[PDB]
Design a protein around this nucleic acid. Sequence first.
RNA 1: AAAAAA
RNA 2: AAAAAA
Lengths: 463, 463
Amino acid sequence: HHHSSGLVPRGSHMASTEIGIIAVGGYNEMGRNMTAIRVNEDIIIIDMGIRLDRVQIHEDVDTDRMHSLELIEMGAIPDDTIMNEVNGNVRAIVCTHGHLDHIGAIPKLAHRYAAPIIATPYTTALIKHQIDSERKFGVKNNIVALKAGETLEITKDITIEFINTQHSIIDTVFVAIHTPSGAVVYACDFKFDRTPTLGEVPDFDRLKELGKEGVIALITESTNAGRNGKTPSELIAHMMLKDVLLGTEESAVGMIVTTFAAHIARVNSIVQFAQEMGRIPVLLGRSMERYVGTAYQLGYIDLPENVEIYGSRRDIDNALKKIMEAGKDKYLPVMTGHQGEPGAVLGRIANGETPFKVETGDRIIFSANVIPNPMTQANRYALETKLKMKGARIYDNVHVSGHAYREDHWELLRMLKPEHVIPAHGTIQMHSEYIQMAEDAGYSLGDTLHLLRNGEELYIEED
Amino acid sequence: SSHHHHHHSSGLVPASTEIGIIAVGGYNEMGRNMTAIRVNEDIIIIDMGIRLDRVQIHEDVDTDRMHSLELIEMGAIPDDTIMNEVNGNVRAIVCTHGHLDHIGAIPKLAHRYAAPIIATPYTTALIKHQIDSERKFGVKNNIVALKAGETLEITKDITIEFINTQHSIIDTVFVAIHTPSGAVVYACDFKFDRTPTLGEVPDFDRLKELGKEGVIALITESTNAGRNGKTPSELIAHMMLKDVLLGTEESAVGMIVTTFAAHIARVNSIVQFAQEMGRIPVLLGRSMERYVGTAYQLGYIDLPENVEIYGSRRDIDNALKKIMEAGKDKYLPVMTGHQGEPGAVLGRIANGETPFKVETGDRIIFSANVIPNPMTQANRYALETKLKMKGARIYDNVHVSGHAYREDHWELLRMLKPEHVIPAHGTIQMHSEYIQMAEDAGYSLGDTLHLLRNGEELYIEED
RNA sequence: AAAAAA
RNA sequence: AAAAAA
Ligand SMILES: [Zn+2]
Ligand SMILES: [Zn+2]
Ligand SMILES: [Zn+2]
Ligand SMILES: [Zn+2]
């Protein structure tokens, strides 16, 4: 009557953890990133960012005076009101680095959470400055510096680990949240760089170790997952910049370099080249003085003792007057204004509001890309037109990306071996590209590969 | 009553040379370049090239068997019949380098001119091979090897000087035709590279000397004059390739590199990297063997004694079978097929017509660009689809251009100080970009800056 | 941005 | 691909 069919060994389940991946902002767009990681009833927030272009489309703005609710209505700050309906209490806010798409919304949203703000030293300095620049939301959260390779136990069941990585700003980290059932890894704004000009090479060994210890979920940026191959190293930008600055038959012509003030590796390269060219490096711009000086006071960069740094309008105008009468061949001005921002040094120069006069053949080196949005594109077009009309020669895009490419994401999937993968930090189109890469690696959409929209919670019941 | 005055000039001399710039091919399109420089009745032809896409659009066509007139009707070679209306006798044919857009039409057009063919040693080797495979015209011009930095006296009034430059193939030169009234400089397919991995740095000193001695006219390529800034050095391609090949956590996976067979510097880099990776470099492909062997056999490269080189179908299939049974992680195959050419090694592999089987995770590195015309785009798309469907990971465009950018052209204008400038070697759109740069430098179109079409002769007289 | 092809 | 603004 009855035949035996077979046997199956049932596994043990010694620890049941309910994980929640909550997408607050930056899953439908570039900017205003915010993620919440729930471990049963505790919540770790990662990255309260701003979306700058939605600010730029309104002329009468002054983000500093606006309340967070209007900023949410504008879509510039993550709509974190969904947090009142996530089942848990926030125990920490973590920021992976100091870019505004990760810390820009801190002074508008952090004060409502009874939780510290945990970040790397440079990031904590930048967060403190960002909060100090507003006196409308009095945000006085405890601010904790956690260095890369260090751990901090936030709950008996939750620990936070920073992993060193590379990016277009120093002191970027992966975040690993360790839970009774494994690790949740957050990797947004990262880049593998085996030859960085500043810092150490990302911790591939620890990444393999984490992959072997158990990763429940990987939250990772999708920004350049559609660019084939691997990201070029910062060394490539360094060498291209060296060739533009030194490899020329027009040594004694005027030269200006503009780049991101927070791109400390790039700025460091530029000032060392200045020493090679026999020119004095002159950093111009409030943001230049702030960011480079902060880096210097934390021991992140070294600086030649002939460097000159001016952030004040009249010190800047005076330095430019001194440069003009001493000879532009005698200095290398590194200044703000690469996106044509009004009020930045290069834009005031282009408008003739300056003692510095651009002449035919003067070289202007944009060690940056143009941010692909119509607003910044219009500003850069106006600035470049003005500079070209005064005879300047433009060296654009002397630059490499700060984001992992498709094959970098492939390698990170192979190292971390996550049970689940969640693309973050982009549009649904960038997520599409990531999804096709992840399917190539074995993941399945809606099963182990998850497409989230702003305001959605993915629940993971890990045995 | 009314009165004024004027000084009449003397009709006396304080012996007249007429210069002619004749555009035959390559001024309306990419490919089939050919220029004629006339000094009163003597003519120096520069570059009889082929335009390959006009061949590719016709099904199953044997250019080697075709007459010159059918090829001209196809648009695939310069229409030199206009030479029967130019008042002079051709005294020399000069080729600036061995690319097919400069030498491909030689076995169809050179034999009708009572003149030698003058080129650099490597270029002469390639020309001799090109003639040997010709099967319709009996070509018996003498081929004279002239090294860079040497001069050769062609007529009582005309000498030819080669100046070394950098390009995507070794032994490229500028040509300076010295006449009684000054020099005519031809600079097509050149690139400034202060750190080349092969050859010497272009002779900037001689270029300045020429500019000060007197240059009547500069004929120059416009190919990338619309690219802002300066061309990245070949060292950049070298370092990107080094990082792709060496910078990975997947040491023991299969890797295949494809690149231009004539890019001897790139191939040299790849083989030295193979030595670093602990793999055996195996060059596969008829063109690979021909070009690399000619370079090695003339002392342009050195090669490790473990290198293997196979141009024959069965040596190739045997080497691939040996690679599969010895382990793909133990070899670095450098092969033809980067444009998806049918019959090339990579294409036959993708078609599964070889012992080599591509598996998931195998890396295919195109150290090349996709040539922007619909035919090669279709071929590369088919090849890439086939490779991706077999699990390959694609690293594309690990590559830098071999052509000067806008500011490189600016500095060459500043060095050579030509009286007249003539853009060549591109479409009228590329010439538009050049013209806009040259107007920035003081030239005026139709006066000292001249946009010529195929089949036009520009006259340059003495004041 | 000018091949591949034995 | 996330600013500037003494
Ligand atoms: Zn960032
Ligand atoms: Zn970001
Ligand atoms: Zn060429
Ligand atoms: Zn060419």
